[PDB]
Amino acid sequence: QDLSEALKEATKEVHIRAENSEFMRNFQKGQVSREGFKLVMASLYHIYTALEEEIERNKQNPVYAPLYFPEELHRRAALEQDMAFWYGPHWQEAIPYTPATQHYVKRLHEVGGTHPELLVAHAYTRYLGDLSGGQVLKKIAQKAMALPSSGEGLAFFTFPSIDNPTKFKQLYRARMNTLEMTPEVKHRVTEEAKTAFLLNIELFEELQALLT
Ligand code: HEM
């Protein structure tokens, strides 16, 4: 079976669970405000920073290299503009770094530093969603919080170097399908994508408790 199909299959149950964290459930109904949105975007700042640092470290390694698309996909620069927007010119000292965010960042460094053959699980979970439901969430955020069409405050959700998210996703899937793949790597990649979804779910439960 193709890696891209194995991953969709392996994560489709947990994706349902993630969709219905309270945080995502409120978000989707347009019950997201400045305070909750800044908590989640600052946490994403730390997460994509660690992920992209590990992508950089492993760019040349064949267990990852086919998925190396910094121009199209990387989010850290976009997150930095959003942080200056939401938190001001001194955002680096102001942004929170929560325990659930540290835990996710810690696993991303373990994977990148010691198990780079699993890094594709983590890029898949984040970037492919960002190119799917993330586009729907962007529209919801922008309406709930009165964010302008010009995109300030939502650079994270905008891919200026991808014309067509759907086509890019198909390309990225075909490329995932050309990684070296053995039963051993396939089994552990799909397991690591369930872990990445859980780390996301635990972040949302943590932020929701912070807010309430
Ligand atoms: C309520 C919040 C969410 C909404 C509304 C949403 C919505 C969607 C939608 C509509 C798709 C396309 C499904 C398809 O056409 O087959 C999708 C795909 C995807 N989503 Fe989400 N989702 C949410 C939460 C999450 C979370 C928390 C993550 C994990 C961090 C995630 C990761 C992904 C991934 C990796 C895919 C690609 C599936 C594939 O094509 O293999 N989503 N999402």
From Swiss-Prot:
Chain positions recorded as heme b binding sites: K8, H15, Y124, R173
Family assignment from sequence similarity: Belongs to the heme oxygenase family.
GO BP terms, alphabetized: angiogenesis; cellular response to arsenic-containing substance; cellular response to cadmium ion; cellular response to cisplatin; cellular response to heat; cellular response to nutrient; epithelial cell apoptotic process; erythrocyte homeostasis
Parts of the chain on the Cytoplasmic side: 1-212
Important for catalytic activity, annotated site positions: D130
Catalytic reaction list: heme b + 3 reduced [NADPH--hemoprotein reductase] + 3 O2 = biliverdin IXalpha + CO + Fe(2+) + 3 oxidized [NADPH--hemoprotein reductase] + 3 H2O + H(+)
Subunit structure: Homodimer and higher order homooligomer. Oligomerization is crucial for its stability and function in the endoplasmic reticulum. Interacts with FLVCR2; this interaction is potentiated in the presence of heme.
EC number: 1.14.14.18
Leading EC class: oxidoreductase
Keyword terms: Apoptosis, Endoplasmic reticulum, Heme, Iron, Membrane, Metal-binding, Oxidoreductase, Phosphoprotein, Transmembrane, Transmembrane helix
GO molecular function, one term: heme oxygenase (decyclizing) activity
Protein name (Swiss-Prot/TrEMBL): Heme oxygenase 1
Localization, UniProt: Endoplasmic reticulum membrane
Post-translational modification: A soluble form arises by proteolytic removal of the membrane anchor.
GO CC aspect terms: caveola; cytosol; endoplasmic reticulum; endoplasmic reticulum membrane; nucleus; perinuclear region of cytoplasm
Induction remarks: Induced by its substrate heme and CoCl2.
Naturally occurring in which organism (per UniProt): Rattus norvegicus (Rat)
Cystine connections: none
Reported regulation of activity: Inhibited by metalloporphyrins such as Sn- and Zn-protoporphyrins.
Topological category with respect to the lipid bilayer: Single-pass type IV membrane protein
